């Protein structure tokens, strides 16, 4: 049946790139996302980000830089409103109000959900265990927290992560000013996860590289000692284990390798889960630890601490963001 | 835009002087 031929071709593990049913949703969503992003990053006109008729120039042809270009977030006048190409009057207020950001975001988020499903799909069609999608769910949670969950919690898509390098930096600074993420324990876990995942990546790579079995000469790459699909183990787990154990103590070095790679998976994945969750609870304004005015002397005078100095810098950031847009002294979410 | 003039010619020799080197090395490997 033509339909059975189609379902064979979609779910085919013969394709150069696997499509599958998550990919038949994923490919058009990426098509729109990539098209509108490459279009807007280069040629979008300035966007009225905070709803106050102050266009922010975010695209590469409006006198702007690869570092400083951004698909500028959707206008604060819009908020969380669905603002597609057709609900605007024209193709120039839609560009002016930041519709391209919302179009890219509304196709990018489901495209990443479909990429995760597609990872599970191909794991199923190849007979391998199905949890690489679980590892991928950590950066996906992180990118949905700063593109969907923080705008929902704060009330506007202007509080989303700008699609640019300097826009991202701006998001970081404003977020620290308004939430003190550095003193958020989920973010300390995320930092431990990314820095320790880098530690453990460098550590595991240096250990496997250091205890390689001699197969080659000195005037050829050690990577030629491995043949793709060879059944023999290309390194010495015993030698790397003995080295690591002598380096710190006896019952420290993973003897096992399946446990070892589960730990390599688990450490940065779990910590990025936690830091995505931290962004998400700060979306409801559950901010980090607060230790201002916490150490008092005998009379009652506040002795400054280092958290006070961090506050003082965060207040520095706090009273400069969205300058012509706070008519009252209380910047709520 | 008051940009560096030679910033164009710095950008393109930074990225194609190594590139031709790689292609030289690749092509002589492939042949």
């Amino acid at each position: 049946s033509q339909w059975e031929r189609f379902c064979q071709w979609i779910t085919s593990t013969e394709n150069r790139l696997y499509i599958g049913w998550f990919g038949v949703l994923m490919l058009p969503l990426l098509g729109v996302s990539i098209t509108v992003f490459v279009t807007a990053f280069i040629a979008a006109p300035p966007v009225d980000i905070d709803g106050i008729r102050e266009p922010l120039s975010g695209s590469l042809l409006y006198g702007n830089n690869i570092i400083t270009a951004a698909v500028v977030p959707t206008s604060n006048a819009i908020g969380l409103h669905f603002y597609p190409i057709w609900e605007a009057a024209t193709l120039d207020e839609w560009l002016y109000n930041g519709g391209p950001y919302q179009m890219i975001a509304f196709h990018y988020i489901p495209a990443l959900l479909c990429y995760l499903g597609r990872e599970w799909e191909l794991s199923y069609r190849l007979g391998m265990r199905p949890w690489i999608c679980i590892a991928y769910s950590a950066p996906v949670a992180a990118t949905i927290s700063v593109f969907l969950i923080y705008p929902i919690g704060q009330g506007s898509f202007s509080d989303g992560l700008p699609m640019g390098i300097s826009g991202t930096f701006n998001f970081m600074f404003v977020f620290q000013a308004e939430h003190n993420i550095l003193m958020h324990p989920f973010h300390m876990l995320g930092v431990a996860g990314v820095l320790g995942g880098s530690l453990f990546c460098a550590m595991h790579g240096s250990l496997v590289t250091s205890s390689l079995v001699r197969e080659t000469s000195d005037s050829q790459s050690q990577n030629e000692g491995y043949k793709f699909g060879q059944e023999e183990e290309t390194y010495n787990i015993l030698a790397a284990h003995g080295y690591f154990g002598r380096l710190i103590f006896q019952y420290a070095s993973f003897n096992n390798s399946r446990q070892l790679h589960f730990f390599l998976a688990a450490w940065p994945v779990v910590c990025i889960w936690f830091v995505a969750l931290g962004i998400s609870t700060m979306a409801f304004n559950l901010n980090g630890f607060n230790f201002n005015h916490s150490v008092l002397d005998s009379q009652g005078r506040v002795l400054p601490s280092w958290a006070d100095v961090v506050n003082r810098a965060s207040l520095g950031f706090e009273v400069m963001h969205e300058r012509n847009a706070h008519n009252f002294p209380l910047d709520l979410a | 835009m008051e940009t560096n003039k030679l910033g164009f010619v710095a950008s393109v020799l930074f990225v194609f002087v190594p590139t031709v080197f790689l292609l030289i090395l690749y092509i002589q490997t492939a042949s």
Binding site: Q220 | T3, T19, L23
Partner: peptide, 30 residues
Amino acid sequence: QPVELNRTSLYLGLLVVFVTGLLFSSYFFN
């Protein structure tokens, strides 16, 4: 032995050159 550069190394080298140049272009232009 003669020098090599296989296809994968060529692609890796091209991307590291191209992405590094895209990164430093904004600062060469200033």
